[PDB]
Amino acid sequence: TVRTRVTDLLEIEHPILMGGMAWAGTPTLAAAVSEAGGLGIIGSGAMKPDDLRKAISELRQKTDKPFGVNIILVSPWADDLVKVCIEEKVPVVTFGAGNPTKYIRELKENGTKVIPVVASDSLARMVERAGADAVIAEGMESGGHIGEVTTFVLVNKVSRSVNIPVIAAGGIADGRGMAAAFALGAEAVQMGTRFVASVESDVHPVYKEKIVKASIRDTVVTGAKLGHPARVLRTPFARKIQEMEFENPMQAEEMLVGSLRRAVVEGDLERGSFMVGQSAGLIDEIKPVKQIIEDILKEFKETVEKLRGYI
């Protein structure tokens, strides 16, 4: 039903992206998102080029619909992962935090849509010129690495500053979020925590369920003094890291090495980084990916009719 500049740009059915997620954005879960009319995205967080090549191929076994790949600029294999996306003709590439200008042009030579994740208007506009096709404006309530501006303000300001489509991310978990994000100027939404809490997800069921029971207050920011702030589930281990950032900052940096995997794969609460957004307190049950998208789209429609009721 709903169609935007983002639906045209990606030949997509719904304006819903799956956030690139390291260790959580598997080919299985991204395929279900693409089959349901959204845009799944493989999270190449801790992947070597062979891992990504195999993941790309095993996603095309599960769907012929468009999909994307997410690359962390800080990754030791960022350059190689970009070339993997090129020679596999990945339709859409997403970039994590940083400035992916050095990769725009060659990805655009190959017909790949480039959508950087930004946390400021000045960087949104900087990549817009660099050639980017769209921009994901991610507020600080999101899970994983965060910026300093909230979704409510960032999406508004970025939309007015660039002419390419803006995709709101951070805190979106239902049809009200999409409506409000669209009201703020976005033309699609990207969700992470809402798509981890799906039956197609293969995260350790502890993870899914810590999301179900988490309130909107049950997150904290770790890594802020080390320069890389990230939002995780409020847990004793996370408070230990907040302390260790001040007292022993290098021992803290090693305490997080591989901490996301012990959360994702093994559901280890004592040594895991359960990256989640504040949206977790908006999530109350595990739903199949297609049901999530259709529920969000109907509620998005009903919210617009209510907003109409005021005129």
Ligand X SMILES: Cc1cc2nc3c(=O)[nH]c(=O)nc-3n(C[C@H](O)[C@H](O)[C@H](O)COP(=O)(O)O)c2cc1C
Interface ranges with ligand X (CB under 6 A): 19-22, 24, 43, 45, 70, 72, 96, 117, 138, 142-144, 169-172, 190-194, 275-277, 279
175-183 vs 289-309: helix crossing angle, rounded to 10: 50
What is the DSSP-derived secondary structure letter of residue 19?
P
Residues 167-226 that bind a copy of itself (CB under 8 A): 170-172, 174, 176-177, 179-185, 215-217
Nearer to Na ion, 61 or 122 (CB): 122
State the Cα–Cα distance between residues 179 and 176, nearest whole angstrom: 5
- Tell me: is residue 20 an annotated ligand-binding position: yes
- Tell me: is residue 143 an annotated ligand-binding position: yes
- Tell me: is residue 24 an annotated ligand-binding position: no
- Tell me: is residue 227 an annotated ligand-binding position: no
- Quick one: tokens of 121? 């208007």
Q: Is 282 in the site for a copy of itself (CB under 8 A)?
A: yes
- The answer to whether 179 and 300 have CB atoms below 8 angstroms apart is yes
Q: Look at residue 308 and give the partner it binds from a copy of itself, Na ion, ligand X, none, a contact being a CB closer than 5 to 8 Å depending on partner kind.
A: a copy of itself
- Tell me: is residue 277 an annotated ligand-binding position: no
Q: Is 276 in the site for Na ion (CB under 5 A)?
A: no
- Tell me: is residue 193 an annotated ligand-binding position: yes
Which residues are bridge partners to 166 per DSSP? 135
Q: Look at residue 214 and give the partner it binds from a copy of itself, ligand X, Na ion, none, a contact being a CB closer than 5 to 8 Å depending on partner kind.
A: Na ion
Q: Going by C-beta distance under 8 Å and a sequence separation of 6 or more, which residues neighbour residue 310?
A: none
Site string for a copy of itself, 241-280 (x = CB under 8 A): -----x-------------------------------xx-
What is the secondary structure of 98-139 as a DSSP string?
A: S--HHHHHHHHHTT-EEEEEESSHHHHHHHHHHT-S-EEEE-
Helices (H), 162-279: 175-183, 193-196, 205-212, 236-247, 249-255, 259-264
Nearer to ligand X, 216 or 307 (CB): 216
- Tell me: is residue 57 an annotated ligand-binding position: no
Least gap, CB of 119 to ligand X (angstroms): 11
Near a copy of itself by CB under 8 A: residue from 83, 240, 271, 301: 301
Which residues are bridge partners to 220 per DSSP? 232
The single residue listed with the structure tokens 């879960």 is 29
- Nearest to residue 13, comparing CAs of 70, 67, 80, 56? 67
Q: Look at residue 140 and give the partner it binds from ligand X, Na ion, a copy of itself, none, a contact being a CB closer than 5 to 8 Å depending on partner kind.
A: a copy of itself
Q: Is 214 in the site for Na ion (CB under 5 A)?
A: yes
What is the DSSP-derived secondary structure letter of residue 170?
S
- Quick one: tokens of 259? 């901490």
- Tell me: is residue 131 an annotated ligand-binding position: no
- The alpha carbon dihedral of 123, 26, 201, 10 has a sign of positive
Nearer to a copy of itself, 199 or 304 (CB): 304
Least gap, CB of 130 to a copy of itself (angstroms): 20
Near a copy of itself by CB under 8 A: residue from 21, 85, 140, 241: 140
Which residues are annotated binding-site positions for FMN? 20, 22, 138, 143, 171, 190, 192-193, 279
Which residues are annotated binding-site positions? 20, 22, 138, 143, 171, 190, 192-193, 279
